[PDB]
Amino acid sequence: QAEVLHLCRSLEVGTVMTLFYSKKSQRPERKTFQVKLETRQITWSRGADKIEGSIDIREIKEIRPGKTSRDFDRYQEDPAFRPDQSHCFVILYGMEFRLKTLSLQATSEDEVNMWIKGLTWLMEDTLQAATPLQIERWLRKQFYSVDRNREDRISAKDLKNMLSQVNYRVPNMRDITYGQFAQLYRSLMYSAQKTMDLPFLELCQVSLSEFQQFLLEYQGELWAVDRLQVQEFMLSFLRDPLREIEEPYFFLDELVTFLFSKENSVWNSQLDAVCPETMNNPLSHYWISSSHNTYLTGDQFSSESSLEAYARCLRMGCRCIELDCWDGPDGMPVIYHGHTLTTKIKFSDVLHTIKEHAFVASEYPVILSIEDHCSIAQQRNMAQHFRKVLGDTLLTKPVDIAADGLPSPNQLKRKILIKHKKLAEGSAYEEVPTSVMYSENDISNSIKNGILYLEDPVNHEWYPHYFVLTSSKIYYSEETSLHSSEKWFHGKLGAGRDGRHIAERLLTEYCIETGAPDGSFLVRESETFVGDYTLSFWRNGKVQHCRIHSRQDAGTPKFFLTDNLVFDSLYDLITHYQQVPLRCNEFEMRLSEPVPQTNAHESKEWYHASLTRAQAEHMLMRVPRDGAFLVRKRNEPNSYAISFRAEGKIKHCRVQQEGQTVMLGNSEFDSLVDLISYYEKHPLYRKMKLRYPINEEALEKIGSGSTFKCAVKALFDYKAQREDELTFTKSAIIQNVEKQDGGWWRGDYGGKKQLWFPSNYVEEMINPAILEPEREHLDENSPLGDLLRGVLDVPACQIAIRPEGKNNRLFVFSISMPSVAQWSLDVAADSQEELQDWVKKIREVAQTADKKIALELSELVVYCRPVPFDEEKIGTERACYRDMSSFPETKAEKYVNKAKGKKFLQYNRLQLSRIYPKGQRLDSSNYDPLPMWICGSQLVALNFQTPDKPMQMNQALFMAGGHCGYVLQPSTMRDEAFDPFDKSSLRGLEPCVICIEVLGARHLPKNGRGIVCPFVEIEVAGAEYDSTKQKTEFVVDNGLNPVWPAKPFHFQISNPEFAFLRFVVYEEDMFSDQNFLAQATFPVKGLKTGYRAVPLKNNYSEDLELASLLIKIDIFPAK
Ligand SMILES: O=P(O)(O)O[C@@H]1[C@H](O)[C@H](O)[C@@H](OP(=O)(O)O)[C@H](OP(=O)(O)O)[C@H]1O
Ligand SMILES: [Ca+2]
Ligand SMILES: [Ca+2]
């Protein structure tokens, strides 16, 4: 305890260490680091002072000693950066699958040791800190993020902006210190929610006998019949040692804050411990947390394989992980997804990662699913490395030779098992006996896979697409992954008094609307003295003007106010008079705030001062890509619209300007220019960013880039003026046209070949390949899955290499189709060798019109022996509990339906089944695990890197047991009558009736710049007969503390042993779409009753800071 207070006190002082950026362009550099205790952040002051970096300690997942990091690996042979493991350590932090890393280089080995032990305690105390203290640190984090920390007092509009950044919009405007800021927060959170229906509930206070009456009458906490128990419960909440030495008391607002806190969670934390009693059934009786292609960080085709993903999965409590082993460059296999562009990591590194992390989250057994493409020698090296590195951790022999069933999880604690094909006794080949020429159309069975490039027909940039060639088709995806600068210089505003009036308007509106100081100013070009300038500044509610003289005399420039000092640049003049007063119109004034320009949009490619809705729509409908956009002024003042194309249709939204800001819905920006720049970087509508500014120039040049056998149409007659020129008549189609800049193209017409003609005497015929493909009847299950954009029928295509490339791409081929004149796609590869490979294989596809296993590795396979699935062995003496079978999603669906589900249940009570996603989910999306689980499948393998609903259900299921990774399947479903498609199979199992009312929410996260308009979807997920969804209405412009109207919900669950209660918070955005904000999913068996908090998670299932709902939940039958 004293050691902890000593430790924390030392790091708030600090330490200096070198930083290895997770960015390549950057070169390592040093800074000082410290732990602001009042907020629990790791801040790194750049140099002993200014604060330039920060990490929230609550996001730290691992503090790892050594140089084990990607950053470190980027400089491991550079001798300038070959540090020492003793001097290096790594913080892994974040709330997504791919954790962020802080890779640091210290000097002492007790320096690193204190930090590591400091953060370890800090991490644990921050995470379990009582909620009033977490709120208190959040309030400080918001505070130390504006002008406060300096003046120690923030403005009143700083508050408006900070509140909007935390999802709260005050109706209209209404300096403050932290104590007053925290007072305002607590008062706002309570006032905004005093309307919630709370029968139990002018800052009154609730006492001990009152809180005890609550816990008992409403919360069903029977322990609270002991008063001293509640006493501590209330003191475990407040955590103020003052006010403690008297009877505990809550204020009303502290009671409401309690109702929202993790201390009031709907989730019974008693189910967070392992129940060792439930860990004694055969392995086949457990749901086992399982990962598919564990090495991958992203999609299945081109993402990075990472050691870090193994560590993340095992630390999320995953127990069955997957290794895809291929022959490596040095006799040691590599791991990556075969036949793709995913990066390769080394088998040896993976094993050490697995060793280091397999039992941090759980003592329970780990299963390595080994997809093996290695030669016999590399299989031997694997077998040798498994045995050496894992030692007694590896399972090498059965637990019970006379058993008739798999061993229990308890019997396999701290064991790692190998799942791998096994030789028949005395054979050199697996007894493999399944004959299936139903070759799945996926990237495994394709002819060639790769990334190739396609010119965008609108901006003429090359973009990468995934290409897949099969034996008859090419599938391609959607695209993959001086003074004039100064704010105070406004240039020429007008040519006469119009410019003076514009300057007076700009300066006046700025000063009035912002309460700007005297001396606020702008500079413009002089309307009266050419080459000179005019300074305008605010003084006594009036605008003052003075001439700034300019002289190019004797070579160098000379700027000066009349009768005043001479300066070399306009910047120097202004910078000087912002520090000491000028004299102007007999007045003394120091320049202060620069007046910003407000109409920078007026010269942008996308801006149209005069344009109707109908004209904008006609313009954008000429553009065959989504993200075509323009901004138009509207007929009413201070009003604009964005017009943009999405899903082949045109949409519009109004942008209103209110003073020095602009608004789009509730999203506030500084200017139209800043607004558009924001939505070029972030999506505006669904996943659509603003990409192409549409004006006359852009429209003219659309689809103009073809090269292969191009035709053009003569617009006029042309008589050859030289012997190398073509002669032709109006409307003539000139063929095979070679296009070049400089005004002259080359083509065939009238018998003459490749003669020159004027470029602007023709229009280029349309290349239909530039148009969007019809995507409505496109194959849902191509090798590309949901990423598919287009299909080409190879026998109807022709291919030709362009030897000179095009558009700064050296390696280009052209696909055409003889029966569709002028249809052509130009396609670039990254290398001449890649180009040659694609061309030869495509052309070959067109001209068509029609495993040994090392004993040393085999010996390590004790259980989890893969055999072809034999439905007829189910229930007979021929079923071997050591044999297992794997099921690709689509095959598994054939067994988890009404017809075969009960027999799949029978199989799974004795033997393991592994389910994994279909090959076509190249995007690493996940299938629904519940229909697999409810038929007793144990190894339901999901892409852990993907933040979708299947992974949210996975982490929810394994919440029972605290993510130990094994959950005992309930006895009712290991009954032989249990049928997931027949609730009559359950017999008289008591059902469960849930009544819920969503009362309010706090600290909801944002989805962009606006303020969310949230609604809550409540779901029960189990068998089909139990599954249903309900939702609340959305509330307007509030994520910080919304409350919802009355809408009582009822759910009835016939099988509460396989049932999940799921809460999803959505926002209704301005386009009437519904966007995920947060979620919490629970097994129904762990639900408490009463007025309960619902602590909210992100889509990766990480705890959000403070975010929660308050519900009223009643469960029947009564406990
Ligand atoms: O890596 P991909 O492309 O997703 O390929 C499938 C997937 O990874 C499965 O997890 C794997 O299951 P099993 O090892 O459990 O069988 C299967 O192996 P298989 O070809 O040996 O059946 C692979 O085909
Ligand atoms: Ca695999
Ligand atoms: Ca990791």
Residue numbers in the entry: 19 to 192, 207 to 233, 245 to 524, 544 to 768, 791 to 934, 947 to 1215
The authors write:
PLC enzymes catalyze the hydrolysis of inositol lipids, mainly phosphatidylinositol 4,5-bisphosphate (PIP2) to second messengers inositol 1,4,5-trisphosphate (IP3) and diacylglycerol. The catalytic activity in all PLCs is encapsulated within the TIM (triose-phosphate isomerase) barrel fold structure, which, in most isoforms, together with a PH domain, C2 domain, and EF hands, forms a common PLC core. PLCγ enzymes are characterized by an array of domains, referred to as “γ-specific array (γSA)” or as “regulatory region,” encompassing the sPH, nSH2, cSH2, and SH3 domains. Recent structural insights have revealed PLCγ1 in its autoinhibited state, which is characterized by an inhibitory interface between the catalytic PLC core domains and the regulatory γSA.
The geometry of the active site is largely conserved compared to the structure of the related PLCδ1—coordination of phosphate 1 of IP3 involves H335, H380, and Ca2+, the position 4 and 5 phosphates engage in electrostatic interactions, including interaction of the position 4 phosphate with K462 and R1010, and the 2-hydroxyl group is ligated to Ca2+ (12). Despite the presence of excess IP3 in the crystallization buffer, IP3 binding to the nPH domain was not observed. This suggests that unlike PLCδ1, the nPH of PLCγ1 lacks a canonical PIP2 binding site. Similarly, Ca2+ binding to the C2 domain was not observed. First, there are hydrophobic, electrostatic, and hydrogen bonded contacts between the sPH and the TIM barrel, centered on the hydrophobic ridge near the entrance to the active site. A second interface is formed between the C2 and cSH2 domains. M1166 and F1167, which form the hydrophobic tip of a loop on the C2 domain, bury into a hydrophobic pocket formed by F706, L746, and Y747 on the cSH2 domain. There is additionally a weak interaction between the EF-hand and nSH2 domains, stabilized by a single hydrogen bond between K175 and T576, which is positioned slightly differently from the previous structure. The PLCγ1 nPH is more akin to the ArhGAP9 PH domain, which points clusters of basic residues outward toward the membrane, and has a noncanonical PIP binding pocket between the β1-β2 and β5-β6 loops. This analysis reconciles our findings that the nPH is critical for liposome binding and catalytic activity and yet has no IP3 binding site detected in the crystal structure. The PIP2 headgroup observed in the simulations, however, is not as deep in the active site as observed for IP3 in the structure.
